[PDB]
Design a binder for this molecule. Structure first.
Ligand code: ZN
Ligand code: ZN
Lengths: 611, 217
């Protein structure tokens, strides 16, 4: 019988049950097919050995299926079953790969999804020394420090090395007296035979809105050992799985006045919960008319604005960040700046682009750069990342652009035309990288945009900042009767099917694909097709109270040139999307004009450009 | 214990025959003793350092350049104690003003692919590594006692010539004078010192996994 009248901790520590368990795990490791006749732990061990990973995953449900007794012994006394399983998986691998001894000679078995997902505030004393699965954000991480694993001292009076004691993570190891000269004294470590292991400490805390309903959020410690270190960064959402181990602290006893012990989770498996084939895309891109079909895929709810849909779609995929051969460092980021009276779904345009995009971040304007911060766990005064370095390759969604402060304004402009920040702070003098595309929305002064003045008046923004934006869309309002029904019906219906009684699959994988497998080229047949427009329009604008299309608009137009290389996979400049580039670069300029000039320039060009 | 010094007196003899014998150049043109000549030309100028190259050491005797990769601590000592016995039989007789033999700081370079700070796993503890980076700080030079001598306090017994270990590790003063418990103090007049700085190395900018601030060593 594999269950007799002892304590589960001490049943498994006996020689008989130990050997029985040892042999029982091998038979499961070697012979376990999964719904197709595949020895899963034959290919999985292989894929582990083709990378030198020394970490094997054991899904718990199958262990319970093929093994009824071990999957009940496990979360009772896991400080020894997870040790026996190690020596089992070793002898398996050293049979499937008899030379693997030259790679780390030690295997750890992780365990995946115990069936007992739990909260972080409901851990009571019942769970001391029991395997546990939890969840929550991580809010700190020290550096990867090396810790003793098999220490070995040396005596100071005999030149003899003491015994190889093992280090347990509750109390400093204590060597006795030298068995060679009885020289009991202050020994020192022997850096050459001692074995070390990585080490990292993190402070996990409850998820923001998940369980912290009407109270404050609790937290816990965790200790990631050798293979696990740097599995997670401050801000990630993870789900631990680890022994919940306590240890005596002398400080808490002197604050609370009672004998009180500290607790810590010795993590055993960390699995993040976040956000991480062409043959269709070939013909789907070769439709020759993917433009219309993609425009009405973003902005899924909000009706109208197929104008600004165009610009934002241009922005999303981006353009081409070519490096000029004259050391001029032209940028390949499209920055947008919405504006319009309150109540026109600007903020929703920001929030949906938060979702559809990847590696995106978000902020309000009412933290932009790295700042000195006292770490929650480590208690050292480190430096933490801001809000323009977390979009170092993706997008930065600014909200309430007007409410920025003078320091914030003098810091935002630097990153536009240089895309690189220096920090000579109290911490240390560094110069980091920031390559992000800015998507922001300002407000009209006086509670309403009025197009008698130029746009540079109702925006309430410093003038050399608006130049750092490529597109200038102006949102407004309408009282047209036939569209009142169109918008009403839509909203009402969207309130009928949301309550407890190109889709979002093509374009996400498409912004993943089309981001990568294209590199648009630049010929020189368009080089003269545009100047014929500039020579005219410069005079046309300077004639009146306005400043014509200047070089910082030609740059935006030439950037949006490639903005369609990502949608069509075209990647070759043609006189077709130049009709589009010029069209857009004037679209974002006629609106930001005067009362009668916004229409005089229209009567000229909107009929001239042959839209 | 007794085989320790008997191995050393056989390594400090094979590290000496390397400096004394390694040549370059072919047989058609003509040869050049590479490290005797640099020892002499750096001693006579008053520099006291050579720059041994690991490929040469490997190509001469293959075992030594492996020990030097595994136990660099206790073998750099033998190398730097053979560089001092070769720089003696090359520059002597020193002319008039110097007749005490100095100490030769043997540096060493190599031509091998560099690791990175993020690849310093604890299994690389006390192994020669080779990492690139960017200097970010610099302390002010300080002293560091190398050959120190102590003295008792009450009975005034001396125990001199004690040698410190290199790196950042101190020393444990006795408490058994042979007088009160710890009767030993340092004699500031008799302690040879050498300079030492302490830099700070940041990892290259194009090797950060791009979610955070670069780490440093
Ligand atoms: Zn001893
Ligand atoms: Zn004394």
């Amino acid at each position: 019988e594999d269950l007799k009248g002892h304590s589960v901790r001490e049943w498994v520590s006996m020689a008989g049950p130990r050997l029985e368990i040892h042999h029982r795990f091998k038979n499961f490791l070697r012979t376990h097919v999964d719904s197709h006749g595949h020895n899963v732990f034959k290919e999985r061990i292989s894929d582990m050995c083709k990378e030198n990973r020394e970490s094997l995953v054991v899904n718990y449900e199958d262990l319970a299926a093929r093994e009824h007794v071990l999957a009940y012994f496990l979360p009772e006394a896991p400080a020894e079953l997870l040790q026996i399983f190690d020596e089992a998986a070793l002898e398996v691998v050293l049979a499937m790969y008899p030379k693997y001894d030259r790679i780390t000679n030690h295997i750890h078995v992780r365990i995946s999804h115990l069936p007992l997902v739990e909260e972080l505030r409901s851990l009571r004393q019942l769970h001391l020394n029991q395997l546990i699965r939890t969840s929550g954000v991580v809010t700190s991480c020290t550096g990867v420090l090396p810790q003793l694993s098999m220490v070995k001292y040396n005596c100071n009076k005999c030149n003899f090395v003491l015994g190889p004691f093992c280090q347990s993570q509750n109390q400093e190891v204590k060597p006795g007296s030298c068995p060679e000269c009885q020289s009991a004294g202050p020994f020192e470590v022997n850096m050459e035979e001692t074995i070390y292991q990585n080490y990292q400490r993190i402070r996990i805390q409850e998820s923001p809105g998940k369980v912290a309903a009407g109270r404050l959020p609790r937290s816990k410690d965790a200790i990631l050992l050798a293979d696990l270190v740097d599995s997670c960064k401050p801000g990630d959402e993870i789900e631990l799985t680890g022994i919940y181990h306590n240890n005596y602290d002398g400080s808490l006893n002197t604050a609370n006045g009672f004998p009180v012990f500290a607790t810590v989770i010795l993590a055993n498996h960390v699995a993040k919960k976040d956000n991480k084939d062409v043959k269709m895309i070939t013909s789907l891109s070769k439709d020759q008319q993917i433009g219309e079909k993609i425009f009405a895929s973003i902005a899924p709810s909000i009706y109208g604005h197929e104008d600004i849909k165009r610009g934002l779609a241009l922005a999303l995929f981006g353009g081409e960040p070519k490096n000029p051969g004259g050391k001029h460092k032209v940028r390949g980021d499209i920055n947008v700046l919405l504006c319009g009276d309150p109540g026109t779904a600007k903020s929703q345009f920001l929030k949906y682009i938060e979702k559809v995009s990847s590696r995106a971040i978000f902020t309000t304007g009412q933290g932009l750069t790295a700042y000195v911060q006292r770490h929650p766990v480590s208690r050292e005064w480190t430096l933490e990342a801001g809000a323009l370095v977390l979009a170092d390759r993706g997008v930065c969604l600014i909200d309430e652009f007007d409410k920025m402060n003078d320091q914030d304004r003098t810091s935002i402009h630097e990153a536009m035309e240089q895309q690189s920040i220096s920090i000579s702070k109290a911490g240390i003098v560094t110069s980091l990288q920031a390559r992000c595309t800015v998507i922001a929305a300002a407000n009209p002064i006086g509670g309403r945009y009025d197009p008698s003045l130029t746009f540079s008046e109702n925006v309430d923004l410093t003038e050399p900042i608006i130049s750092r934006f490529d597109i200038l869309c102006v949102v407004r309002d309408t009282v047209d009767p036939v569209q009142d029904e169109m918008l009403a019906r839509f909203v009402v219906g969207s309130h009928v099917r949301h309550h407890p009684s190109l889709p979002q699959e093509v374009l996400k994988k498409y912004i993943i694909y089309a981001k990568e497998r294209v590199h648009p080229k630049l010929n020189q047949m368009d080089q003269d097709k545009v100047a014929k427009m500039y020579s005219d329009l410069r005079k046309e604008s300077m004639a009146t109270g306005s400043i014509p299309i200047t070089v910082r608009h030609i740059e935006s137009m030439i950037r949006m040139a490639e903005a369609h290389a990502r949608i069509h996979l075209r990647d070759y400049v043609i006189e077709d999307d130049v009709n589009m580039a010029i069209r857009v670069m004037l679209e974002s300029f006629i609106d930001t004009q005067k009362f009668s000039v916004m229409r005089s320039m229209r009567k000229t060009f909107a009929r001239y450009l042959s839209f | 214990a007794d085989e320790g010094q008997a191995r050393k007196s056989q390594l400090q003899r094979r590290f000496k025959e390397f400096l004394r014998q390694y040549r370059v150049g072919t047989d058609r043109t003509g040869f050049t003793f590479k490290y005797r000549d640099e020892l002499k030309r750096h001693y006579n100028l008053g520099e006291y350092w050579i720059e041994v190259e690991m490929e040469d050491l490997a190509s001469f005797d293959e075992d030594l350049a492996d020990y030097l990769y595994k136990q660099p601590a206790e073998h750099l000592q033998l190398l730097e104690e053979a560089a001092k016995e070769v720089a003696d039989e090359v520059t002597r007789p020193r002319p008039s003003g110097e007749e005490v033999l100095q100490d030769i700081q043997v540096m060493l370079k190599s031509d091998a692919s560099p690791s990175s700070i993020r690849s310093l796993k604890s299994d690389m503890m006390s192994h020669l590594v080779k990492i690139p980076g960017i200097i970010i700080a610099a302390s002010a030079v300080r002293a560091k006692a190398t050959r120190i001598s102590i003295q008792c306090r009450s009975c005034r017994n001396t125990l001199t010539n004690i040698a410190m270990r290199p790196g950042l590790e101190g020393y444990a003063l006795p408490r058994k004078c042979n007088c009160p418990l710890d009767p030993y103090f340092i004699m500031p007049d008799k302690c040879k010192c050498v300079d030492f700085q302490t830099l700070k190395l940041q990892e290259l900018p194009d090797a950060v996994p791009h979610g955070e601030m670069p780490r440093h060593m």
